[PDB]
């Protein structure tokens, strides 16, 4: 199938809510080894977002049931989903490292794919264990930081991809590293830097940025509320 | 319309006439150009003060006002959206408008095209504005970039924050624009945000 | 794997919203050739409802994109080929469940309540098949759907109370089949009015365990008639 | 309490004693049994009439109501749902309640356990009722029916009429919930069109 036929199949699969098909089509477009269009990139991301996301939700569900007398298949089932999830992550991570990240020309695109690299390493570390877990968590932190550095130097503080990264990396610090301190630091900074330079907002993606800034603000007020204290009362 | 153009020169005269010939092709009639000009000059202050207060306009004020209103008819689309900046000290009409909700300035909305306004000091409010119903008026008087929006133009507060200096930083978009305005097709979805 | 282990796996799958897995487990339980419980039956139905349902929605979506396009080129050609891919999947799901019905479910059914359920089901999936089928193959599925529904309808009429949720549920589905599939609003509104009227006439027959099930379905029947009836008026006093 | 038991006898009062065949270990006290009995007898008509209208209750009516309201607070939610039937001629309190919404009869709700009521003739309203807070007064002194308290809020699950006039209803006691008359995943398993 030709690149165009694939992208068209992908768009139809999206509409049909056949994400496995959508992922399949865009993987093949990526595997053609070319600098994906922003539309192509978006399609690939949205597809895999939905493929991995499904397994993440089932995992969390089965894991919740595991907390609440032959729960031997519950474990087996969690492990089945765990296996699927890893294969999905290893599918998208190979795509990133082998094609996506090296083919990225503009820093806007490089930041996106590095953000993505930390996102799927975070998904991995959520089900990972032992020394394997400490590797994924570090691989996540590396990818997210590498992107964060490129974003601070090449993108405006209001950029939706820069802001989106801020939210996800801040969530990683909170959820994964269990550092509310570093989480809030990142989110406060990113938000404050963006409100300070609101004139940098793009007329095409302004409601994208404001929306993400609201999510950062919401997270900060939630996270600081979960980290109160003492003493004079 | 000439009835307005004549009535304009009869009240302001020299000051009104001054602005004629200040456009390349000229979408606006002689009457409209004059009213916009007279506004941009010194009448903007007293006129908006009167509109906001709800006070009864002067003959010359009503003249400028209907001259503007006439020009603000058809000048909506204007196919593209524009980013403009406005600062206020000691009160803003949008302070009454909470985030997500719409409200309007009972006077005309003067907003500069220069981002210097957004980075200006000792302000009360600083707002980055997105809209298309505005009229590009700069070059006309008396210096050298600014877009001005109609009286009672309803605006949605997309974002508000009272920064580490007490200054309110806002994001305003023209109510009309929609809900899909300002979003890059499926990028929010493609960003796989945590939320 | 043991029957109990499989039902636990199906219950787990359901919760995890892994319907393909849910159907896999219940297919295996059914394939053990032993009469399904009501809990087992429910699990099997809910699973396949969701497996076939996905493809039905996917079909309706694509078929609509394929008929609302001015792009008299490749974009429409893709639509058809993709629609055919989903069509293929859908048929495989239906044959799979129909084989389960005819080979195991319907013969093993002891109580008429259970037999009506599986016959209702037999019509239901033949109707799903009929929606995407074409030519002589289409006329077969449509008539197979009707046969199964009518066979179920006679037993429900003679063995179930007019308020029974399985009897009422059949009522609604069979009435929808007549409207949607046979394109007979007449026969559709006939079945629906009857079923509803029978049930309101004998509201004392309602079961204290499934009364809100029965009322809910009766509301859906009432809604369908009041709709199918507004779309077919046929009157002009200006004679 | 005895204060009410004694009050009931020095008033009604030979009609009150009647409903006392001892037992001796019933769920309801001597006072409550008498009140319920006196209701089921002939006082149901005049008592409910004054409750529904507003009218201050007669010295005797006050005590029956007192005895009745006491028994309901003693029994309440009785874990399993019962099916009972109610008829109306000349208007029903629930005519004011539209489908899906809740309302109540300002008097006590008498419902017969016999399905004959649902298939009875010359009716204004016919309603099949599902509840738990009711009281079986057939097991009490004679004769078959279940009473629900005054101002008992009921949800109208279904309403229809006619060929012509008589409206048929499905009433469920508001308290019972949302999951009350549903058989575990049956609706889901029936793969309905909607």
Numbering used by the authors:
A (entry chain B): 3 to 70, 76 to 240
B (entry chain G): 234 to 377, 380 to 430
C (entry chain A): 3 to 241
D (entry chain E): 234 to 376, 380 to 430
Passage from the reporting paper:
Two of these, exotoxins-S and -T (ExoS; ExoT), are homologous enzymes consisting of an N-terminal GTPase-activating protein (GAP) domain (73% identity; 81% similarity) and a C-terminal ADP-ribosyltransferase (ART) domain (78% identity; 87% similarity). The ADP-ribosyltransferase activity of ExoS and ExoT and their cellular toxicity are dependent upon association of the ART domains with 14-3-3 proteins. Here we present crystal structures of human 14-3-3β in complex with the ART domain of both ExoS and ExoT. Collectively, our results indicate that 14-3-3 proteins act as exotoxin chaperones rather than activators.
We co-expressed 14-3-3β with either ExoSE379A,E381A or ExoTwt ART domains in Escherichia coli (for details, see the Supplementary Methods section). Using immobilized metal ion chromatography we isolated hexahistidine-tagged ADP-ribosyltransferase domains of either toxin—ExoS233-453(E379A,E381A) and ExoT235-435(wt)—in complex with untagged 14-3-3β. Our crystal structures revealed an extensive interface between 14-3-3 and the ExoS and ExoT ART domains. If such an event was coupled to catalytic activity, it could provide a layer of regulation; possibly, multimerization acts as a sensor for the presence of high amounts of exotoxin, i.e. conditions under which heterotetramer formation would liberate LDLA-box 2 from its binding site.
